[model samples]
Target: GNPLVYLDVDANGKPLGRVVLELKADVVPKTAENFRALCTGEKGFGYKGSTFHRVIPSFMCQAGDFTNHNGTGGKSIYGSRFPDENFTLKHVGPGVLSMANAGPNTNGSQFFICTIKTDWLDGKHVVFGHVIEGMDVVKKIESFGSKSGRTSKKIVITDCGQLS
Candidate 1:
């Protein structure tokens, strides 16, 4: 029962656009549920004003840190750390949305959207969703960050919620 979530990102000094994500709940139930809760504010906080704290053009644009603007701050909807879903998908192509974890079984609210095929990240991250539309926007966010891995401009999630 995967559903769609719309992501409205605003990058500093960049004309970023919206992104549509198709969460693979049928394949990754727990991970997808956690994401759904976060997006809908069912977890008490949404991605409405979060930032794309990490970006690497031709690699990935990461966001969803609703708690702390920094990448080190975030938690699941459950209010604590959660185990990793049995990740079966791969980062075989662009527009793949996956979880950002510090280590194994430490999946939190952080996520990333790939801008290019990164098969090398296949087994390391949990692929939960993929961009079904507005990938050009994703590219714009990707290019907003500087070479230091952090964005020179602030990238904000103007709006984010479920699409029915």
Candidate 2:
């Protein structure tokens, strides 16, 4: 199945733009499963109203920190954490969505969308999804948070779910 995750972002106090992402379940099943659960709110939680806490220009935009407003806290559907599924995919280009973790196998709700070549992160994070639309929207965010790496304006995920 080609299930997708749609992200609606309010870019730098402007109107919201939609970014559609295609999940690569065949490559990283467990990693994609964790992200799918968070998007659909399958077990009472999702990325419905989360913020993109960390955004680095020429790098990536991070989100899914639903548990905490800041960049320090987030959990998986499993309540604690899950093991790293696979690192086969590489973060070679922009518009790549990958899992964020403290170390290894600490993947939680936190995920990032790359806006530039982040090859240094290759094999370090699980690349489970890829952007299908709205790369400009991501650039808008990247520009806004380019200074402090944090957006003064709220970048909310108005709604998110599996789009089959």
Candidate 3:
């Protein structure tokens, strides 16, 4: 069975809350297992209060990078990549979550949710889950690059206990 992963975005020290990733169990098993394990393990447990760090509208929002507080340095350090978890699913509309990779099967902890419809990504990215709620929070997050002195919102996974 597939599992569900939730992403909670926080801004500064405040709680920006969570966005659930409803992973279909039968769709992508290996990919889902790895993500689920990481979520509950000691290492992933440290993700609490982690900042989104980067949020670019229309394109994508990245937050799994643990180096430099930005995603730039994380790629090489964590070696966060995996073989493509190809499935029959397609990247269709907004709130669609998939593994972020530069090439075939190079997924790590980095995942992104689409803000708009994207057909270009069909069958390429591994669709592990979908946003159940809090998309408004995802869209309203303030970017660190904002000229208004705003910073990127933080996404803390407060709980992965009830995930199924």
Candidate 4:
């Protein structure tokens, strides 16, 4: 029932801070709980130890690939993947958190945080959350991205959980 969750980030060369996320659980319950449960690690495996393996300074920062610690692997608590909840939650601006998928109805554990206002992803990705108190931490993570969407150093989600 909690809508606020967070990640404690570990930057390779700096002390990364806490990223407080405000999930739109009211709008997308299934999508939001997946993320919240991932943060809480109630499923015994989640965002912990995962790296933000992808990032683009002008686009978004990505992670939650617990299976491979990269882009190609992850598992949803629901099993492997789940269908998109809806596209009503628009990607209006930076800090928008949305599901990362291969295509339709393939949402897994992987998700991303937008770095700027994105247009094309609005109807394509399920926007379930947003960063409420850690844009600076996000920008710090964004610093590691190269032009190719490859991170220069391993930016890990060292710890995470739901905040009361």
Best by lDDT: 4
Lowest-sum lDDT 10-residue window in model 1? 9-18
Query: What is the lDDT for 3 in model 1?
Result: 88
- Model 3, 1-164: lDDT tens per residue? 45666655555556666677777557777666666655555454434444565556665555555444555433322355667767567777878777766678677666667777778888778877677887876676623324332244444444443356
User: How many clashes does the backbone of model 4 have?
Assistant: 0
lDDT of 4 by residue, 55-143 (tens): 99889999999999868999888989999999998888989999999999999999999999998987899999999999999998998
Q: What TM-score against the true fold does each predicted structure earn?
A: 0.94, 0.93, 0.75, 0.96
State candidate 4's TM-score: 0.96
The superposed Cα distance between candidate 1 and the true structure at residue 82, in angstroms, equals 1.0
Q: Cα lDDT of model 4 overall? A: 0.91
- Arrange candidates by lDDT, descending: 4, 1, 2, 3
List where candidate 1 sits over 4 angstroms from the true fold.
13-15
Clashing pairs in 1: none
TM-score of 3: 0.75
Q: Please give the CA lDDT of all the candidate structures.
A: 0.84, 0.84, 0.61, 0.91
Error of 2 at 92 (Å): 1.4
Clashes of 1: 0
